[PDB]
């Protein structure tokens, strides 16, 4: 028994040495001569005033105009950002909701939470209403994230330390990803939707392969739980947000950490992470009731988004990069620009 | 300056707003009770006399109760316990006969200490049930309570032993100026537990409404 336990330890030490010989220079030295972005002032442009409880998730449509939000009052609401109008209001069977997704084609939305079930809703019906298209069951822990690949596939992340890839037309798990040791709290699909990353409560992140269902790489370094994760727009790096009040930038090809986004004035954890269209600004939401803007390439702090009266729980940036939306534990969303 | 189609959209949005407000009032007249307990608390029992999450809706004397049971959640409590910040009260069940099994009472005491002084339930009243009192008063004359509480001083009689256990549980409430604990020795397997929950909930409701507008 200990022979395998010893071999696993020395093999782990070999990896740590192998990826140390590749760290000849840091990102700070390389980007030590470029001009800083300066100071970023973002004014609030809209405020969405429909929910009656805490808002837990949101997602943008690929047309950069519609978005869906979920709150614990049991409603999904689809907003029109430009006019602030409400397009749809969907009543959920269970009000314990913690995730939300919008299909890339725009025909469906997804939802899930403490009921261990992911529900697919059909938006474009001949009868004029919104119907539950499918209910996916099989997870033994709460649903914490879900993301569409296309109209027939979806990846879900659960609190039973597993991720799964479904088939909506049939309702079965095509593949199961079983590597983690704690609850999996976040999820992010690559730009080409060929592979994805997940962050769990064992203070590690893993890089999965959708086609073969195996773990490629494991990234460590955080001292506590991981709550948020996001790919760089290039598709060759990603960022994580943790409860130790620190964001980190990992690199797939170099296979270790690059930057740490921390300061002595922040002591609260991160709830959400997102990039800008160019990959130059990193936006992070905190429990301080406000969002921070980081110069992702120099680790400076460039601005603040302080307009909320409670914790900021979700955060997203449009596909054309024109705006940022933040939901919070008060019942308001805000569009910043 | 709006179009002809651009105004029917606003009318639809206003009707959606109206229905949202109307639905937010039917759900504000119900009492939400989170139902905690030890490992062998007896959640099924608490259901009988009175996947993931399990709900239960009933009605007593024109009052509507929703009772959430979270015994099936095997995950980490600190990730989903903030979802229940805002319930009217918490029902905590303790078996009085679990002072000899293995020690087992100390786990209940630790769980009560964790829940009572949690940072989310800082102003949520707790209704404490002490079940199985018949077994407690039958066993107490064959196994001294000093097994679970060495520092006991009283005698092997149910009347003072039960009071000592109740005091030990109530002493774990640190902030005795914002939270109240209602204790009930549930037994007789009849409609005396629903009545106690009703009384405690009306008291909680009155004090909450008073606390909103100063007064407290």
């Amino acid at each position, epitope marked *: 028994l200990d022979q395998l336990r010893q071999e696993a330890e020395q093999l782990k030490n070999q990896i740590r040495d192998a990826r140390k010989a590749c760290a000849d220079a840091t990102l700070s030295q390389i980007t030590n001569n470029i001009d800083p972005v300066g100071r970023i002032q973002m004014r609030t442009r809209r405020t969405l005033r429909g929910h009656l409880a805490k808002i837990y998730a949101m997602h943008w449509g690929t047309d950069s*105009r519609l978005l869906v939000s979920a709150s614990q009052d049991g409603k999904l609401i689809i907003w029109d950002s430009y006019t602030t*109008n409400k*397009v749809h209001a969907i009543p959920l069977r269970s009000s314990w909701v913690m995730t939300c997704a919008y299909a890339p084609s725009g025909n469906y939305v997804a939802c899930g939470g403490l009921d261990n079930i992911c529900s697919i809703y059909n938006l474009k019906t*001949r009868e004029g209403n919104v119907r539950v298209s499918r209910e996916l069951a099989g997870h033994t822990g709460y649903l914490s994230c879900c993301r569409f690949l296309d109209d027939n596939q979806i990846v879900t992340s659960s609190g039973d330390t597993t991720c799964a890839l479904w088939d909506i037309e049939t309702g079965q798990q095509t593949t199961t990803f079983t590597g983690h040791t704690g609850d999996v709290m976040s999820l992010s699909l690559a730009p080409d939707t060929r592979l994805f990353v997940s962050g769990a409560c064992d203070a590690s992140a893993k890089l999965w392969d959708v086609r073969e269902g195996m773990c490629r790489q494991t990234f460590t370094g955080h001292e506590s739980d991981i709550n948020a994760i996001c790919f760089f727009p290039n598709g060759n790096a990603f960022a994580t947000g943790s409860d130790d009040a620190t964001c980190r930038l990992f690199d797939l090809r170099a296979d270790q950490e690059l930057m740490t986004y921390s300061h002595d004035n922040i002591i609260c954890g991160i709830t959400s992470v997102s990039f800008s269209k160019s990959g130059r600004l990193l936006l992070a939401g905190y429990d301080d009731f406000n969002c921070n803007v980081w110069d992702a390439l120099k680790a400076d702090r460039a601005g603040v988004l302080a307009g909320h009266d409670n914790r900021v729980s979700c955060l997203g940036v449009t596909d054309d990069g024109m705006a940022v939306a933040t939901g919070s534990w008060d019942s308001f969303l805000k569009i910043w620009n | *300056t709006l*179009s*002809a189609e*651009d105004k029917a*959209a606003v*009318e639809r949005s206003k009707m959606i707003d109206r229905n949202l407000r109307e639905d937010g009032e039917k759900a504000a007249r119900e009492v939400k009770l989170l139902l905690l307990g030890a490992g062998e608390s007896g959640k099924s029992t608490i259901v009988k006399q009175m996947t993931g999450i399990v709900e239960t809706h009933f009605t007593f004397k024109d009052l509507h109760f929703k009772m959430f049971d979270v015994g099936a959640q095997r995950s980490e409590r600190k990730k989903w316990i903030h979802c229940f910040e805002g319930v009217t009260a918490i029902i905590f069940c303790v078996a009085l006969s679990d002072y000899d099994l293995v020690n087992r009472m100390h786990e209940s005491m630790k769980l009560f200490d964790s829940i009572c002084n949690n940072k989310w339930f800082t102003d949520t009243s707790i209704i404490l049930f002490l079940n199985k009192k018949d077994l407690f008063e039958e066993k107490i004359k064959k196994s001294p309570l000093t097994i679970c509480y060495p520092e006991y001083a009283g005698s092997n009689t149910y009347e003072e032993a039960a009071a000592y256990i109740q005091c030990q549980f109530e002493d774990l409430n640190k902030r005795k100026d914002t939270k109240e604990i209602y204790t009930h020795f549930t037994c007789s397997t009849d409609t005396k537990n629903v009545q106690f929950v009703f009384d405690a909930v009306t008291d909680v409701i009155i004090k909450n409404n008073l606390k909103d507008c100063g007064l407290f």
Partner: single-chain antibody
Amino acid sequence: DVQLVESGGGLVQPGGSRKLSCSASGFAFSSFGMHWVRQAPEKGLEWVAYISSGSGTIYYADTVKGRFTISRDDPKNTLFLQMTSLRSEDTAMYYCVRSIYYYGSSPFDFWGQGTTLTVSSSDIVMTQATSSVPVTPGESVSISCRSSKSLLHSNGNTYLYWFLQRPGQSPQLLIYRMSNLASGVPDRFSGSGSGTAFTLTISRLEAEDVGVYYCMQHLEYPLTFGAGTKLEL
């Protein structure tokens, strides 16, 4: 199965009164606004009235305002048109049309089946200069419609609609807002054009495409139609 069935027509004396009904079945009737559209015995379509969802908004044409009254009964899924003092110019066939308005919706998408009424004896002008064209199957033809005012609004939308009425049938939506293709319509139909000049293009024309094509504007009330272009042969 989204059918709208309607009845109440017949022969009525001039100066009389009548009531028409439209009983819906197979869709969320409460969420759709409803229209009445009138089509004279050998003429083009003509808008009549409109009632919103929730009955909070009602419009009438100038020809019928003060005489007609539109109402709905949501629990029973029924649409009414109470009409009094009928002239000899009201003999026509009346259609029941549903339409729902939100961002990206498709108004005027389903039409009723028609009940015939016979009675014993500024507005935007939409122009369709051509009256009839002979068409050979397998070819391509274009139909033009012209407006007296710019249909392009400040928000970027051009409110032009194209309908097709096959012989002895109800009109069917083809294109909404000048570019979008209605669901269930083959891809060989396409629409284009700028303000005050529009065109409908059909490629590889074949059977079941003969009929009359109408262009309607939805920029402001009252809604107005074109005279219609007929494809034969």
